[PDB]
Design a protein around this ligand. Structure first.
Ligand SMILES: Nc1ncnc2c1ncn2[C@@H]1O[C@H](COP(=O)(O)OP(=O)(O)O)[C@@H](O)[C@H]1O
Ligand SMILES: Nc1ncnc2c1ncn2[C@@H]1O[C@H](COP(=O)(O)OP(=O)(O)O)[C@@H](O)[C@H]1O
Ligand SMILES: [Mg+2]
Ligand SMILES: [Mg+2]
Ligand SMILES: [Mg+2]
Length: 704
């Protein structure tokens, strides 16, 4: 009774339903199959129907609503619904009563119109295909950015909006109010705030929005944390608003509304320009849909108050797992057509569930769609594009793992050579503190070997010991040996309320300087770094609380929802407080603070031999400069003793050494190097006049 072609179309649709593992074979499956059927195809072509858009809409609906049934034990196969059987039976009855030999796809197409409450019939009417059309065929033959969203909808620049009926209903209801007419979509990034504004414009086009909003057109404004860079925000915006307020039912969508208003301007329009237009202050009234995040609504919008009261807040919550699975299932056919691949039902669910578990700084549905797009694209890298089959979760897992992070590079070469030699390298610049450097390098190597927490700084150290023994020098050299930036902050400048009777008397907040800008700005600008905090004992308790968060979470929150990632930072805090005796450090710093440290790196006093090594180091540096000028510097043992004695103090450590070397070894050579015996090279002998306790200087030209 049915055509060969019809029966083939049925088999191909039956085939697709058992590989997608659909439990039901529906009327929408039938219409979809009819798109491959020659007679039904030609009928739809005669009515000028874009078969691809119909293909996409049917497939999307089928995937969102058809239950999948792959599991274990006693279960069932693919089964035609009562309605499906009803349609085919209606076609057979019509055809037999009409005097025709066989049922064709076009006859089934006529039968589908009688399924009044079906999605298939709904889509046919949406595409303006009338039942009569098939019967007649069977028998015979603002200026630039992303503006007019209504126009974008008429073509296909806007991706379809799945679900979120309640949110759309609430936005429409808000726009319909006499006062407080402006919806303010509030939600996290990636949740779908822009998608809802855009999805509304589509509803206006479809006429799925009541008569009062029929003439409405949604215009999106050219936005994208504070705007004021050349032109004239005052007149251009005024001319824009007058062109919108030009007697029309125009809705102005302003994405990221927290940009223009709430923060801080520099001009004289922004907040004040829009404020006039909302109620009435001209000869019209406009409506605005805003979009912002939860934190930007509470703070800069509601408290600083730009226009907060004129807006109606609509909470746009992150979709659930199942709601997101429905969203991906509804977009899936467009991704499959683009990537030439098929995503399994299990991969789709895995994309959503694994993104929820491991991509924690982002939100659904955005992060799940990115994973799906990325997995489809990844398939192109493998030869041509390996279709996939009854497994695909493993692909999703690789993609999610790449997004959740993996930045390696610590194996057989380059980094290995520096880490293995760090101890020795630092021991060449800093003496008398082998243990300190050893413990420091053991901790860097441990973290570089992938052993440690991901949500914590590379290392958190408290460098304790006496003044001028190598604490600052070690961290400065550590940063140069690692090849990373050195971010330095003095905690004596962050005590909050101690320095004022002198002249520097501007301490408002201080913690405000670390937060509101400095500390975070420096860490965002230099993710890989050594963060040195001098004299940590003088810091204000608010700084310590901030430091506890850094050591616990590896992140800071400041400068308007900014994230300072401390994951690749070596935190070093130096203290003089105890004076290495170790029990004194326990009293000064709380157990809570001390137990979050990876190590309290102890630094000892300098020996007489270490002080002599510091002197030699200063002398070699000078010899390097002098040797390049053909000048040989020799400093006698007694003179080295003299420099050691003068450049070291128990209370200052080796702090006075630089000055002492400069005054007694560098300055006395200046005249001879410029206009004396050393002009063309030569020798300098520095000795000690014993019973005078003063250095001796001998010169000889490169004229022996
Ligand atoms: N309900 C939805 N249906 C289809 N796609 C959605 C839906 N919600 C969000 N998206 C998509 O997820 C991504 C993030 O949505 P978007 O509107 O940009 O989030 P937001 O504006 O809140 O930051 C976009 O690709 C958007 O198309
Ligand atoms: N351990 C040492 N090895 C080599 N030079 C040192 C050593 N200790 C001090 N110095 C010299 O003295 C100066 C002061 O050292 P520094 O690390 O800044 O002291 P502190 O331990 O108070 O932080 C350094 O710049 C360095 O020139
Ligand atoms: Mg957006
Ligand atoms: Mg200081
Ligand atoms: Mg110090």
């Amino acid at each position: 009774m049915l055509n060969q072609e019809l029966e083939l179309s049925l088999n191909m649709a039956f085939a697709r339903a058992r590989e997608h593992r659909h439990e039901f074979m529906t009327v929408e499956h039938l219409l979809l199959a009819l798109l491959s059927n020659p007679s039904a195809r030609e009928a739809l072509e005669a009515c000028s129907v874009d078969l691809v858009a119909l293909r996409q809409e049917l497939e999307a609906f089928i995937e969102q609503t058809t239950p999948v049934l792959p599991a274990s034990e006693e279960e069932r196969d693919t089964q035609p619904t009562l309605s499906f059987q009803r349609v085919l039976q209606r076609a057979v009855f019509h055809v037999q009563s009409s005097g025709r030999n066989e049922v064709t796809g076009a006859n089934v197409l006529v039968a589908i119109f009688s399924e009044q409450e079906s999605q298939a019939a709904y889509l046919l009417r949406k595409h303006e295909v009338s039942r009569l059309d098939v019967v007649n065929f069977i028998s015979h033959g603002l200026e630039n950015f992303t503006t007019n969203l209504n126009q974008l909808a008429r073509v296909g620049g806007i991706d379809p909006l799945i679900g979120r009926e309640k949110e759309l209903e609430r936005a429409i209801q808000v726009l319909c109010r006499r006062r407080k007419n402006n919806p303010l979509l509030v939600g996290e990034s990636g949740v779908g705030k822009t998608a809802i504004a855009e999805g509304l414009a589509w509803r206006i086009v479809q006429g799925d929005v009541p008569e009062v909003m029929a003439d409405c057109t949604i215009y999106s404004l050219d936005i994208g944390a504070g705007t004021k860079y050349r032109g004239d925000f005052e007149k251009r915006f005024k001319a824009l608003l007058k062109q919108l307020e030009q007697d029309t039912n125009s809705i102005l969508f302003i994405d990221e509304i927290h940009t223009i208003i709430g923060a801080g301007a520099a001009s004289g329009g922004q907040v004040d320009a829009a404020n006039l237009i909302k109620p009435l202050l001209s000869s019209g009234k406009i409506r605005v849909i805003g979009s912002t995040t939860y934190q930007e609504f509470s703070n800069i919008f509601e408290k600083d108050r730009a226009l907060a009261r004129r807006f109606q807040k609509i909470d746009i919550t992150e979709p659930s797992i199942e709601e997101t699975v429905q969203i991906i299932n509804g977009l899936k056919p467009k991704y499959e057509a683009h990537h030439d691949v098929r995503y399994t039902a299990k991969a789709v669910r895995a994309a959503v569930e694994l993104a929820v578990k491991y991509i924690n700084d982002r939100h659904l549905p955005d992060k799940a769609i990115d994973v799906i797009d990325e997995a489809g694209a990844r398939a192109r890298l493998m030869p041509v594009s390996k279709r996939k089959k009854t497994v695909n979760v493993a692909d999703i897992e690789s993609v999610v793992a790449r997004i959740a992070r993996i930045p390696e590079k610590s194996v057989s070469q380059s980094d290995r050579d520096t880490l293995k030699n760090l101890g020795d390298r630092l021991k060449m610049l800093v003496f008398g503190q082998d243990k300190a450097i050893e413990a420091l390098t053991e901790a860097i190597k441990m973290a570089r070997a992938g052993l440690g927490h991901e949500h914590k700084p590379v290392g958190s150290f408290l460098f304790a010991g006496p003044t001028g023994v190598g604490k600052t020098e070690v961290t400065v050299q550590l940063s140069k040996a690692l090849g990373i930036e050195l971010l330095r902050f003095d905690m004596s400048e962050y005590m909050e309320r101690h320095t004022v009777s002198r002249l520097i008397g501007a301490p408002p907040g201080y913690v405000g300087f670390d937060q509101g800008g400095l500390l975070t700005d420096a860490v965002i600008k230099h993710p890989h770094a050594v963060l040195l905090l001098d004299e940590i004992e003088k810091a204000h308790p608010d700084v310590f609380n901030i430091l506890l968060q850094v050591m616990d979470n590896g992140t800071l929150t400041d400068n308007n929802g900014r994230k300072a990632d401390f994951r690749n930072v070596v935190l070093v805090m130096t203290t003089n407080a105890g004076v290495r005796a170790m029990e004194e450090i326990k009293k000064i710093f709380t157990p809570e603070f001390r137990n979050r440290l990876d190590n309290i790196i102890w630094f000892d006093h300098l020996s007489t031999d270490v002080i002599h090594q510091v002197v030699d180091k200063f002398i070699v540096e000078l010899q390097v400069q002098l040797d390049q000028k053909g000048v040989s510097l020799e400093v006698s043992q007694e003179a080295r003793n003299w420099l050691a004695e003068k450049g070291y103090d128990r209370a200052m450590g080796a702090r006075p050494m630089a000055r002492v070397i400069q005054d007694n070894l560098k300055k006395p050579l200046a005249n001879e190097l410029l206009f004396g015996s050393l002009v063309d090279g030569g020798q300098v002998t520095v000795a000690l006049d014993k019973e005078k306790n003063e250095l001796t200087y001998g010169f000889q030209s490169a004229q022996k």
